[PDB]
Design a protein around this ligand. Structure first.
Ligand SMILES: [Zn+2]
Ligand SMILES: [Zn+2]
Length: 55
RNA sequence: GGCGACUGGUGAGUACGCC
């Protein structure tokens, strides 16, 4: 919860974007330009996802 | 450490790159 929690990076962090460890989304090494990391469709984003809990 | 880039869908910045 605390910001200091991120200090876990000292022993590998948890990227809440890619999921990988060692780094954080804040600075993910994902060589991506722009894509929906919610569905997995490049060109758009989650905020612009087509399957966003919409019936 | 600094910077750059970025995204903020991003912990706030340094995992990357370099020295
Ligand atoms: Zn990542
Ligand atoms: Zn989508």
């Amino acid at each position: 919860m605390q910001k200091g929690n991120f200090r876990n990076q000292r022993k590998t962090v948890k990227c809440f974007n890619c999921g990988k460890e060692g780094h954080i989304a804040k600075n993910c090494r994902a060589p991506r330009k722009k894509g929906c990391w919610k569905c997995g469709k490049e060109g758009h984003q989650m905020k612009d996802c087509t399957e966003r809990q919409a019936n």
